[PDB]
Amino acid sequence: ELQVIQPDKSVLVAAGETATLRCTATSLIPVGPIQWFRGAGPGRELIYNQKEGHFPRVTTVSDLTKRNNMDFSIRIGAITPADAGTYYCVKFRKGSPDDVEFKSGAGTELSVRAK
Amino acid sequence: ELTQPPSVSVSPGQTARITCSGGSYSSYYYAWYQQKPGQAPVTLIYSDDKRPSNIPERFSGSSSGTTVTLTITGVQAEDEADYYCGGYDQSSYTNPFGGGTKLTVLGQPKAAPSVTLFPPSSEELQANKATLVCLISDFYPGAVTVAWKADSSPVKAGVETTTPSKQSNNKYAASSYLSLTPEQWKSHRSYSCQVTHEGSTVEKTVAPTECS
């Protein structure tokens, strides 16, 4: 059974720098997109979506167009204290009306040192 | 490998289903592609069930078990085409396609072919070959039998071509060319194609005589 690994429990970064949030998957089956969120509640905030959408602050560490790719780590540029919080890497499987959440990493606590 | 039926048929306004087998719901994404002849395919459905904005609401897709299905809800005569299923198989990093399914619309009742005959041109005859052409115009359904006769049944000197179902009237048209030497053309007299079709009670022969 597929695992989503967030290797880093916490990340400390200076304001204005690039934060690297790491995530790998042990398999690409079952099929379905990876997404990043801040928070794990119902009010959680979408940070990156493999399927669709524009996320200009977000760069991917690896080439996600590589058929082979299993690295879903992201970089968030010009970080501010407003960016701090817990970030979760999430695998969805295909589902009929909607895709459904399948596996999650254990989270990454992003801390920002001001100024 | 992905497998789909060679053909499917539907009355206009009705709902048609076309399914590919040989995939696996958990290790594939599927798409559907429409092609008229030897022209660029058009993507109808991607990620199993998603429709690009430019594609009519009557096309939908689904998938489960070993199967993927394109549904067309309100078949129109202009949907006459070949429909390909295309998978991405995540287990092997490959992109299998089915052989394609032609959608035949029934719209039409039987329509007998108009049959026409054309003898070789004098122009062609100088060049040292005689081509004889039998035209079957604006008939339905596809199946037809053309036999050539120099009063004797000639075989293996003829080749046929068919249009695709016409986008407006849902007819086919068929040509058969008989190819002979002029030597051969000049020693015989009666040229005829005999056309057998469901819309014809009995066969229609059409003929010329060489000199006339």
Residue numbers in the entry:
A (entry chain S): 3 to 117
B (entry chain L): 3 to 214
Structure paper excerpt:
The anti-SIRPα blocking antibody clone AB21 was discovered from immunized SynVH chickens, which contain human VH immunoglobulin (Ig) repertoires paired with the natural chicken light chain repertoires. Since clone AB21 contained the chicken light chain sequences, we carried out humanization as described in the Materials and Methods to derive the humanized version, named hAB21. Humanized AB21 (hAB21) retains the SIRPα binding and antagonistic properties of the parental AB21. The structure of a Fab version of the antibody in complex with the IgV domain of human SIRPα v1 was solved by X-ray crystallography. The hAB21 Fab binds to SIRPα at an epitope highly overlapping with that of CD47, with the VL domain overlapping with the majority of the CD47 binding site while the VH domain CDR-H3 inserts into the central pocket of SIRPα that is crucial for CD47 binding, in agreement with the ability of hAB21 to completely block and antagonize the CD47–SIRPα interaction. The chimeric antibody AB21 binds to human SIRPα v1 and v2 alleles with picomolar affinity, potently blocks the interaction between CD47 and SIRPα, and cross-reacts with cynomolgus and murine SIRPα. Two allelic variants of SIRPα, v1 and v2, are present in the human population at various frequencies and zygosities dependent on ethnicity.
